[PDB]
Amino acid sequence: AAKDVKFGNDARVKMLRGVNVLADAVKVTLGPKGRNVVLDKSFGAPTITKDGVSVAREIELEDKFENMGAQMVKEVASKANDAAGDGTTTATVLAQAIITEGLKAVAAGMNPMDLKRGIDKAVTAAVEELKALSVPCSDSKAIAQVGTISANSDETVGKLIAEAMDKVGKEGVITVEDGTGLQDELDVVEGMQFDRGYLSPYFINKPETGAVELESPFILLADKKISNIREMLPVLEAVAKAGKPLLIIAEDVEGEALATLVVNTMRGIVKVAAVKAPGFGDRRKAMLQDIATLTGGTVISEEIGMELEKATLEDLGQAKRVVINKDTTTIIDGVGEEAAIQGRVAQIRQQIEEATSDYDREKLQERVAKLAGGVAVIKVGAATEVEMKEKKARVEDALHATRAAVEEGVVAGGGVALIRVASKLADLRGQNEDQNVGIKVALRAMEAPLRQIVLNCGEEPSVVANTVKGGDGNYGYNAATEEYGNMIDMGILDPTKVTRSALQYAASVAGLMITTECMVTDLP
Amino acid sequence: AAKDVKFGNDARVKMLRGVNVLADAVKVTLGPKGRNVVLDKSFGAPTITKDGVSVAREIELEDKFENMGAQMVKEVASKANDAAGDGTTTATVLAQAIITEGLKAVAAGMNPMDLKRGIDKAVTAAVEELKALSVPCSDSKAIAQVGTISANSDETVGKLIAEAMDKVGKEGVITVEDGTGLQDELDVVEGMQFDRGYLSPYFINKPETGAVELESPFILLADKKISNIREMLPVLEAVAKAGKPLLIIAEDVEGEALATLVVNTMRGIVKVAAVKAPGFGDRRKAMLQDIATLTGGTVISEEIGMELEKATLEDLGQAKRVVINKDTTTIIDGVGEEAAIQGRVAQIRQQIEEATSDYDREKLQERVAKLAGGVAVIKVGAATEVEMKEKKARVEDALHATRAAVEEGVVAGGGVALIRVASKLADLRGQNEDQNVGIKVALRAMEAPLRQIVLNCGEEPSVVANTVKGGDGNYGYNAATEEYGNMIDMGILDPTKVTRSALQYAASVAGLMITTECMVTDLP
Amino acid sequence: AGGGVALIRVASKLADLRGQNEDQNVGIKVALRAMEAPLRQIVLNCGEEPSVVANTVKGGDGNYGYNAATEEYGNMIDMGILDPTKVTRSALQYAASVAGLMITTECMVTDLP
Amino acid sequence: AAKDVKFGNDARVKMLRGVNVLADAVKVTLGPKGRNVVLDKSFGAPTITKDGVSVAREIELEDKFENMGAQMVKEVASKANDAAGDGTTTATVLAQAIITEGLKAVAAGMNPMDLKRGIDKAVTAAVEELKALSVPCSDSKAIAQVGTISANSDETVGKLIAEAMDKVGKEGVITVEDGTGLQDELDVVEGMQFDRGYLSPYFINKPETGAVELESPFILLADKKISNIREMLPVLEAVAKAGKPLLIIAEDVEGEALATLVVNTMRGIVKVAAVKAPGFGDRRKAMLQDIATLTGGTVISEEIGMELEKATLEDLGQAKRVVINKDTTTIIDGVGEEAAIQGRVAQIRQQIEEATSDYDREKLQERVAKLAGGVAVIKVGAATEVEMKEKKARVEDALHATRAAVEEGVVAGGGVALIRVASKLADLRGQNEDQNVGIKVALRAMEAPLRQIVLNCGEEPSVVANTVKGGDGNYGYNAATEEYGNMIDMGILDPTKVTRSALQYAASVAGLMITTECMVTDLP
């Protein structure tokens, strides 16, 4: 169709307006004293939330260019959230600060490419300094303590997370499930997780969680790409008459098969989720065989000559529960007898010692580790439905935060890690004066989030920023208690991964938008 | 879809306008001298009502932001009504007062978070003082007296309520049914009540009552989640052939099963209501088995192997009458042989003495109490059918008021409890000047409802408010008789729970709205 | 101590004043913030952060203040920044008088456009 | 009356628009290949001119704020022209460049005060560099060469200027008059020049030169400030009866006397020019006594006793010709016995002998030098009257240029002195980054005039600017011949005073606009 094209200053002004709207919408929900945003719903009861993720998801502007700016900032912020589990609001406010200052500099006649170079240099230095400033969270005590912080200062969640990581390992798989009794239950089941996600968002059983969840589903193990529904239609009918959901994993699902499966998911006659097989090639085939061994099913391979049409219910894999997210798929408690898994891991180990290349050996190490480690299941127990659901949500959030912490440690939260990093990097310089301007822009932008937090608190932003800059280490201004001190001791912690990802994604999107010259959108 | 976003002062002004419209619509219907509001209907006959609940339910504005403000106040007022059975008008007028004064202070530059702290601190102090000021309502004479007041000064209704409470207990289940003869009849039948509600509002048989009511319905008892209708086409068709209503309770009903049941209800071919099972896990299964013992049916348990496909009409439980409300579900006179009930309660009792933990013993004691107490059915009768229906409605509302009274006592009605509480709390202070201003806002807000009542009476509001403030205890102003006195003796009562819930919900919504900075809604 | 620091010092030492009515207390707070204002305006003209400089001058004592020309603190008397006490007193008193007259103003009468 | 007030960015934008209009109007007439601008006249015949002075004098915009910007740039450019005799266009284009870049930087958020400081620092360093790069114009050969260059490469004018300067001295007074014969005549007459000028432009006899010229006028000498017309009314009547012009010099002329004299000049009945007395205090009285000795008149001193009523035509001083300009007043060939002049100069020499302080000695030395030096009169002759007038104008222009040259030497003209100086100063730095930005702004603005000249020539500005920057000394680009070389050798000479004054005045006005924040103008 006919397109509308904006060039140079006008395009950047429109992006600035859109980003300003989105960032003003999401920034008020930042900090312990964060305000709340009223979101309309078609049902009639407005939703009052302090969560910046929902506010960002709701935002969409009428103007097409402003919509572009808001949508791209939203996309990078959501990428930050997916990578880290938090920091969407921080990423968005950082992006707004960088974009505002960089576009002001560009309108001043600076060179946009040199500004982007300076921004990237400052952000790389900031990431290195944050890695320096992070304190490790490897011990069980620190794991439990950060878990307690993440779950709104609840020690039970922290001790559960610490026990789970002690049982399975900090690299192990931990999943939260509903617990029948009042007491919490932790156990190790046979399962595995891989990085493949659902093929279509319409498979999502729980939109609030944003992930596909199935109870006692059937596993389909195919070595060929699925394109025609007729190939597996008898298997689909057998699953439907069985009454249990079906999970299909293969090389790929495309075309009319995917379309009809998605249509069935809207219809609800048969609940089937489509996930690609992990990896590619011989490694993909090997991992499919491992999944078949785990679930007790059999893989459908073309080279064997056996086909999908003759496949029946008994040939399918079965598991107690599976969780599929857009970034990963988790298989929990597949029905596979222990001796089969023991023989599988034993032959994997013998393949390990007979192998020579380091890359293959490492890949087979991680394969056997994810096969034999299993999945630790945390059964959240409570007395009431609402309190049980709230506790489960808190446990999930704390699990994400603690995973980030054990990955990369924890820095001083509350937006003071960035202010400390900017204070220590204030001496950085670039090749060109424009690069120096970009570096200064990045430093001021990293200043911004703490200023926003203390503005939400109602206190003076500049005074608090100066006071925190004067200090050193983890010294900072606790927003909740309105008093300065050591952030680590006061319990205001942010995982290093969260802050690092927020800063990096905000910098990337801000550089992309600063170096933007033209737009192409549909006409109004 | 494109969204319209307001920030700061504009958003709060729009919310203030919407709340002002809703509160002006519902406030004139407050007090004995309350005016009436004409609500249009599509049929052609306008409805003249003095009930604030209907006026609130009918209010919906064209401006999206004003609509969201009005809808938030409506939702919290409805929550107050559900919790207490009255006070929707009081909750709405209190919310309007707090919101107006708090937004004026915010526009003055006051800190919104500190204002909210002052508001909810003053409200907590007010709740404590109200608990101090309440008089007990445990004795049968006081129960009858408050019931008489509730039913427009009718001693027969109070006598019936007092007799029912004596027969079953203040914690027992009491239900009102139409009486065949003129004389009112009370009897105790085997039944039990749980807090689960209907899954969809489309199940409501009587919209005026707002609850699902069935006559001699069939009870379905499943330990599995209900998603597929194909599991229970046979029993549904058998019930349809029998022609009796069907009530289904299981872990959950959703998806195509829920859709087709709602379709059947809207078509009217089969009357089926869907209600979840109480509790979760082992206690949920035990309560489902208790309901099976009560109704004489059998629980479709997956671990047993029994399936809904092979379920027969004799397997379904049967009850004389069931009432389903969004807050709770009541089973009345379930047809099941008594010796099963005594055996089940003896089994629960022996479980009690073999039980050890306090939590399990308390849960088992509650279960056995609700199983053995039964349901006391009040068969209200009259000479004429129309006056019999009117008397049934009066008995229902008096029963709700008396349940609230026996829950938390009663205070002086007519809006003088709040003015007395404000008079005694006038010396409260907060940490900051902003908290003090919030406390003053809350106190003036608690003053407001009596002013509105005496304004509807046409008398001067300030003079009456000052005169009531000068007094003490339950001394107040009677709106009907236009002369002061002891409101407890003069028959102007309000249950303590009603006033407490109204104040708390108004405070919560006003705090949410005062600290609101951003509003997101669809474009016009 | 000229340069607008006499008023901020006076406000710092008067921060504990109280009145009979709460509105009187609010009016006193208004007067104190207004007394803070001129130094903030000067340091805004200088391009420096107003709140930080105002806080730093408040934390000091005596004639210690901030010099606009040299952009650094110190004793304002010895740094050559002098304002006669009559000038500051008259400015404050006349500003207070006009602000009181306008705050308590309810009606204005003017010719038509 | 009512005023329109603009604050901050919009006011500066209005300045930028007005300055852009004026600078684009005058900047096309820059360089040998300069275009011409058509100026409307009420008479009907438009004026086509390549002179930036007239174009600037004609510019006046309709928007009041843009009018302010244009008018103040015009005023500073006129001051530069008055001080140096040339450089209005260069000053205006430099001011436009500085203002544009400075306003862009201010919009970038740089501190305007720091930008002004950096601009002033760069301009001071540039004045030092210009002094370093200037070559002296002391020798008579260089004086003749500069005079020849100024008068469109005419050897005769340069020779006349050089020989007149050798005859009377570089500090001496040289005046150009119409020549009776074909040959050019130079003679030295007794006269002096002081820096006082006419009170109001309404005294201007010839608007083309902007100066008052009188043929054989009468001189009035009063030691009192003239305020009442009736005091000198008999003198005015006697002058009008005589029919010759009158020149009045006293402490000041104000009030009704000034009004009547202006009215008489406008009507033309009496042609009298009013000039203030030179100096102040006893110095003023001594200078009036010197004037009386020179012109043979008598000083009307109140303390001595004579009154302006008693003054007669014989007491009035008489001169052959006088020229009055707003910068200075010249008395040429005042009639008076040489014996009186010799006695007066001997008196001044004996005050030299008796004087002690260096200041008084220097002042008396200046007085005796300017009294005994006389006035050199250049009588320009030609074949016809019109070319005689053209030659007289060229001679006057060359005289001004040569006076500037002997004052401060000459530099490489054609706008390459500024680019050379900027190349030298490219390593300058300031205390703050904003000062560095101001310095860079000044340097690029210094580049600007050469770019404008070579753009008028049709060549690429950037390539020529880079080529000139690559060279050194007086190496540059000749605009007329479109080929590089040495400005001094090719005769493209600009007096150092002209470039210095243009640069300084442009810097001053640009700083004034950069530090401008508010405006007050009458409403449209």
Cβ contacts (< 8 Å) between C46 and chain D: which residues? 113
Q: Is D176 helix (H, G, I), strand (E, B) or coil?
A: strand
Q: Is A32 annotated as a binding residue?
A: yes
Cβ contacts (< 8 Å) between B64 and chain A: which residues? 40
Residue B494's nearest CA partner among B2, B165, B32, B28 is B32
Extract the tokens encoding A374: 């299993």
Residues 6+ apart with CB under 8 A from B445: B94, B97, B98, B101, B506, B510
Q: Is D434 helix (H, G, I), strand (E, B) or coil?
A: helix
Nearest CA distance, C110 vs chain D (angstrom): 15
Residue B322's nearest CA partner among B248, B382, B263, B396 is B248
Alpha carbon distance C103, D391 (integer Å) = 74
Chains B and A touch (3+ CB pairs under 8 A): yes
C55 close to A (CB below 8 A) = yes
The gap from C-alpha A484 to its chain's centroid, in whole angstroms, comes to 32
| Number of residues that make up chain A | 524
Closest alpha carbon within chain D to A434: D437
Extract the tokens encoding A288: 């499919």
Does residue B53 contact residue B88 with C-beta atoms inside 8 Å? yes
Alpha carbon distance D156, D144 (integer Å) = 9
Which of A21, A38, A389 is best to mutate for the B interface (most B CBs within 10 A)?
A38
Q: Is A31 helix (H, G, I), strand (E, B) or coil?
A: coil
Provide CATH code, domain D192-407.
Answer: 3.50.7.10
Q: Is D494 annotated as a binding residue?
A: yes
Architecture of domain D140-189+408-408: 2-Layer Sandwich (3.30)
DSSP B113-176: HHHHHHHHHHHHHHHHHHHHH-B---SHHHHHHHHHHHTTS-HHHHHHHHHHHHHH-TTSEEEE
Out of A105, A433, A436, name the one closest to residue D108 (CB): A105
Out of A25, A33, A182, name the one closest to residue B113 (CB): A33
| A contact chains, 3+ CB pairs < 8 A | B, C, D
What letter does residue B203 receive in the DSSP assignment?
G
| Buried b / exposed e along D268-304 (16+ C-beta atoms within 10 A) | eebbbbbbbbbbeeeebbbbbbbbbbbbbbbbbbeee
Asked if B281's CB is within 8 angstroms of A59's CB, the reply is: no
Which of A451, A455, A460 is best to mutate for the C interface (most C CBs within 10 A)?
A460
DSSP A442-477: HHHHHHHHHHHHHHHTTS-HHHHHHHHHHS-TTEEE
Pairing outcome for strands D329-334 and D317-324: antiparallel
B228 close to A (CB below 8 A) = yes
Question: Which is it for the CA torsion D120, D123, D125, D128, positive or negative?
Answer: negative
| Buried b / exposed e along B413-424 (16+ C-beta atoms within 10 A) | bbbbbbbbbbbb
Residue A476's nearest CA partner among A450, A444, A503 is A450
Cβ contacts (< 8 Å) between A444 and chain C: which residues? none
Alpha carbon distance B469, B424 (integer Å) = 9
Q: Give the type of residue at D223.
A: D
Quick one: CA torsion of B18, B24, B29, B31, rounded to 10 degrees?
120
Q: Which residue has the tokens 């009307």?
A: D300
Q: Is C67 helix (H, G, I), strand (E, B) or coil?
A: strand
Q: Is A86 annotated as a binding residue?
A: yes
Alpha carbon distance B168, B402 (integer Å) = 14
Extract the tokens encoding D50: 């390549």
Which approach determined this entry? cryo-EM
Residue A64's nearest CA partner among A18, A2, A103 is A18
For residue A192, is it left (φ>0), alpha (ψ between -120 and 50) or beta? beta
Cβ contacts (< 8 Å) between B113 and chain A: which residues? 33, 457-458
Residues 6+ apart with CB under 8 A from A440: D433
Q: Which residue has the tokens 């060039």?
A: A7
Q: Which residues pair with A37 in a beta bridge?
A: A49, B518
Alpha carbon distance D100, D82 (integer Å) = 25
Quick one: CA torsion of B420, B422, B425, B427, rounded to 10 degrees?
-120
DSSP D39-73: E--SSS-PEEE--HHHHHHH---SSHHHHHHHHHH
In chain A, ranges of CATH 3.50.7.10 domains: 191-371
| C contact chains, 3+ CB pairs < 8 A | A, D
For residue B31, is it left (φ>0), alpha (ψ between -120 and 50) or beta? left
**A1-134+410-524 falls under which CATH superfamily?**
GroEL-like equatorial domain (1.10.560.10)
Longest dimension (CA), chain A: 74
CATH of range B191-371; options 3.30.300.30, 3.50.7.10, 3.40.50.2000, 1.10.1060.10: 3.50.7.10
Burial class (CB in 10 A: 0-12, 13-18, 19+), A71: middle
Residue A329's nearest CA partner among A276, A266, A268, A401 is A276
The gap from C-alpha D427 to its chain's centroid, in whole angstroms, comes to 34
Write a three-state SS string for D265-296: HHHCCCCEEEEECCCCCHHHHHHHHHHHHHHC
Asked if A215's CB is within 8 angstroms of B2's CB, the reply is: no
Does residue A53 contact residue A4 with C-beta atoms inside 8 Å? no
Chains D and B touch (3+ CB pairs under 8 A): no
| Number of residues that make up chain D | 524
A2 close to B (CB below 8 A) = no
For residue A228, is it left (φ>0), alpha (ψ between -120 and 50) or beta? beta
Residues 6+ apart with CB under 8 A from D291: D192, D219, D221, D249, D297, D299, D317, D331
First to last CA, chain A: 11
C52 close to A (CB below 8 A) = yes
Q: Is B268 helix (H, G, I), strand (E, B) or coil?
A: coil
Alpha carbon distance A423, A470 (integer Å) = 8
How far is the CA of A288 from the CAs of A195, A232, B240, B289, in angstroms? 13, 18, 48, 43
Asked if A108's CB is within 8 angstroms of D104's CB, the reply is: yes
A109 close to D (CB below 8 A) = yes
Does residue B19 contact residue B26 with C-beta atoms inside 8 Å? no
Provide CATH code, domain A135-190+372-409.
Answer: 3.30.260.10
C85, containing H or E segment = helix C85-103
Helices B88-107, B9-27: crossing angle, 10 deg rounding: 150
In chain A, ranges of CATH 3.30.260.10 domains: 135-190+372-409
Asked if D114's CB is within 8 angstroms of C46's CB, the reply is: no
Out of B230, B520, B522, name the one closest to residue A38 (CB): B520
Nearest-5° Cα angle at A226, A222 to A230: 105
Which of D7, D111, D431 is best to mutate for the C interface (most C CBs within 10 A)?
D111
- Main-chain dihedrals φ then ψ at residue A333, nearest 5 degrees: 55, 65
Asked if B280's CB is within 8 angstroms of A178's CB, the reply is: yes
In chain A, ranges of CATH 1.10.560.10 domains: 1-134+410-524
Q: Is C69 annotated as a binding residue?
A: yes
Q: Is A34 annotated as a binding residue?
A: no
Alpha carbon distance A162, A402 (integer Å) = 9
Burial class (CB in 10 A: 0-12, 13-18, 19+), D30: buried
Alpha carbon distance B316, B296 (integer Å) = 8
Write a three-state SS string for A409-440: CEEECCCHHHHHHHHHHCCCCCCCHHHHHHHH
Q: Give the type of residue at D241.
A: K
Which of D115, D428, D433, D434 is best to mutate for the A interface (most A CBs within 10 A)?
D433
